[PDB]
C-alpha cells in the first residue's frame, strides 16, 4: 500500500544519491497512485462521501484528481466539497484548472485561474492534502501553444504569477505544471525550468495511443520523460488512461504493464483516468454502475470496465487476475 496524508505528511522534492524523487516530511521517497475524476461539470456525481471512501479505503488510492474543465462558475462549488471529501478520506488532492479547448492557458476564456487558485489557497492555508495543478494540458486547439521552446515559454509565463502568488502566501504546495502537445513534452521545461523546489512537471499517456518502447526505440511520451529525468527535473502524471487518445478503445493493458513498470521504476506518481460511467473504455465504471456505491459500501469488481478492474489491482498493488465475464 502506497502511504497516505496521515503518515506521510507533507510531500517534498528531496534529492537522494544524486538522483530527485517526490519524497514524505520524513526524506523519503513517496509515490502517489490514484483517480481522477472526468469533467466535474459532466460527471459531478463522483462527489459523494461513499465514493472517495471506497477509493482511499478498497483501491489504496492515495490521490484524487478533481478535473474542472473551463459552463457554470457553480463547478468551483463541487471542487470545494471534493477537497473536503478527499481530507476527510485521507487522500492527496490534485486541483485541476482542467483546460482542453482552448489549449492556451492564457487565451482570453481562463482568465480567473490565479484567482480560482487565490481562493482555494485561502480556504485552505498552506493545506499539507492539497497539490495545485495549473494547467491540465496545454495544446495547439484555438492557440499559439506551440509543440516547442516558444510553447513552453507561453506556459511558463502564465504559471509563474500564480506559483508566486501562491508562494507568497507561504503555501509550500506540490505544484505541477502542464507542458505542450497535451502534456506530453516536460523534456521542453529543461530549456528553461521554473526556479521553484516543489515545482513538478506533468506527462500525459493513452496506452492505446503510445508504447513505451515502438520498433527498437523509445517512444516520444517516453523519451521525454526520461530527457526531463535525466536533466534533474522531476515528473508526475496526472493523466493517463488504458484506452486510446480518444478516451475509448481497447484497453491495452499489456501495454499499461510496461508503461507502469516504467512509472514505477522511476518513483513517477500516477493518475488514472477516469471515474466516469461514460461508455467508453477508459471509464473506470461499466454504463450500469452508480457513482455513489452506497453507504458502507464498494463497487464490486463486477461493477468496474476491464480498465477500471486493472487499474484498481494496480493502485492496490495485488497481481492482476481478472475475473470470467462470462457465466451461464
Ligand atoms: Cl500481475
Same mark, same amino acid.
Do not use: C
Given at each position: 500500500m502506497?502511504?497516505?496524508?496521515?503518515?506521510?505528511?507533507?510531500?517534498?522534492?528531496?534529492?537522494?544519491?544524486?538522483?530527485?524523487?517526490?519524497g514524505?516530511?520524513?526524506?523519503?521517497?513517496?509515490?502517489?497512485?490514484?483517480?481522477?475524476?472526468?469533467?466535474?461539470?459532466?460527471?459531478?456525481?463522483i462527489?459523494?462521501?461513499?465514493?472517495?471512501?471506497?477509493?482511499?479505503?478498497?483501491?489504496?488510492?492515495?490521490?484524487?484528481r478533481?478535473?474542472?474543465?473551463?459552463?457554470?462558475?457553480?463547478?468551483?462549488?463541487?471542487?470545494?466539497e471534493?477537497i473536503?471529501?478527499?481530507?476527510?478520506?485521507?487522500?492527496?488532492?490534485?486541483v485541476?484548472?482542467?483546460?482542453?479547448?482552448?489549449?492556451?492557458?492564457?487565451?482570453?476564456?481562463?482568465?480567473?485561474?490565479?484567482?480560482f487558485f487565490?481562493?482555494?489557497?485561502?480556504?485552505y492555508?498552506?493545506?499539507?492534502?492539497?497539490?495545485?495543478?495549473?494547467? +491540465? #494540458?496545454?495544446?495547439?486547439?484555438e492557440?499559439?501553444? *506551440?509543440?516547442?521552446?516558444? =510553447?513552453?515559454? %507561453? !506556459?511558463?509565463?502564465?504559471?509563474?504569477?500564480?506559483?508566486?502568488?501562491?508562494?507568497?502566501?507561504?503555501?509550500?504546495?506540490?505544484?505541477?505544471?502542464?507542458?505542450?502537445?497535451?502534456?506530453?513534452?516536460?523534456?521542453?521545461?529543461?530549456?528553461?525550468p521554473?526556479?521553484?523546489?516543489?515545482?513538478?512537471?506533468?506527462?500525459?499517456?493513452?496506452?492505446?495511443?503510445?508504447?513505451?518502447?515502438?520498433?527498437?526505440?523509445?517512444?516520444?511520451?517516453?523519451?521525454?520523460?526520461?530527457?526531463?529525468?535525466?536533466?534533474?527535473?522531476?515528473?508526475?502524471?496526472?493523466?493517463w488512461?488504458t484506452?486510446?487518445?480518444?478516451?475509448?478503445?481497447?484497453?491495452?493493458?499489456?501495454?499499461?504493464?510496461?508503461?507502469?513498470?516504467?512509472?514505477?521504476?522511476?518513483?513517477?506518481?500516477?493518475?488514472?483516468?477516469?471515474?466516469?460511467?461514460? +461508455? #467508453?473504455?477508459?471509464?473506470?465504471?461499466?454504463?450500469? *454502475?452508480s457513482?455513489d456505491? =452506497?453507504?458502507? %459500501? !464498494?463497487?464490486?469488481?463486477?461493477?468496474?470496465?476491464?480498465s477500471?478492474?486493472?487499474?484498481?489491482?494496480?493502485?492496490?498493488?495485488?497481481?492482476?487476475?481478472?475475473?470470467?465475464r462470462?457465466?451461464?
Amino acid at each position: 500500500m502506497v502511504k497516505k496524508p496521515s503518515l506521510a505528511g507533507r510531500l517534498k522534492i528531496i534529492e537522494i544519491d544524486g538522483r530527485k524523487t517526490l519524497g514524505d516530511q520524513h526524506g523519503n521517497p513517496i509515490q502517489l497512485r490514484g483517480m481522477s475524476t472526468h469533467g466535474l461539470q459532466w460527471f459531478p456525481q463522483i462527489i459523494n462521501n461513499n465514493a472517495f471512501s471506497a477509493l482511499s479505503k478498497d483501491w489504496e488510492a492515495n490521490v484524487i484528481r478533481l478535473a474542472m474543465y473551463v459552463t457554470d462558475p457553480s463547478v468551483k462549488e463541487k471542487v470545494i466539497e471534493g477537497i473536503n471529501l478527499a481530507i476527510k478520506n485521507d487522500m492527496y488532492v490534485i486541483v485541476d484548472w482542467h483546460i482542453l479547448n482552448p489549449g492556451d492557458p492564457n487565451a482570453k476564456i481562463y482568465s480567473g485561474a490565479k484567482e480560482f487558485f487565490k481562493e482555494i489557497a485561502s480556504k485552505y492555508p498552506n493545506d499539507l492534502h492539497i497539490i495545485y495543478e495549473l494547467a +491540465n #494540458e496545454p495544446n495547439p486547439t484555438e492557440s499559439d501553444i *506551440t509543440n516547442d521552446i516558444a =510553447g513552453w515559454e %507561453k !506556459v511558463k509565463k502564465y504559471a509563474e504569477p500564480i506559483i508566486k502568488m501562491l508562494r507568497d502566501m507561504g503555501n509550500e504546495n506540490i505544484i505541477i505544471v502542464g507542458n505542450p502537445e497535451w502534456s506530453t513534452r516536460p523534456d521542453l521545461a529543461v530549456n528553461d525550468p521554473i526556479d521553484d523546489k516543489n515545482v513538478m512537471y506533468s506527462a500525459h499517456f493513452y496506452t492505446g495511443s503510445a508504447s513505451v518502447w515502438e520498433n527498437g526505440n523509445k517512444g516520444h511520451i517516453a523519451r521525454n520523460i526520461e530527457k526531463a529525468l535525466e536533466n534533474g527535473l522531476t515528473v508526475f502524471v496526472t493523466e493517463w488512461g488504458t484506452s486510446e487518445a480518444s478516451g475509448d478503445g481497447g484497453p491495452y493493458l499489456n501495454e499499461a504493464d510496461e508503461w507502469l513498470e516504467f512509472l514505477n521504476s522511476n518513483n513517477i506518481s500516477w493518475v488514472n483516468w477516469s471515474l466516469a460511467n461514460k +461508455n #467508453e473504455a477508459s471509464a473506470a465504471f461499466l454504463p450500469t *454502475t452508480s457513482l455513489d456505491p =452506497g453507504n458502507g %459500501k !464498494v463497487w464490486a469488481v463486477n461493477q468496474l470496465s476491464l480498465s477500471g478492474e486493472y487499474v484498481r489491482a494496480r493502485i492496490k498493488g495485488i497481481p492482476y487476475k481478472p475475473i470470467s465475464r462470462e457465466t451461464m
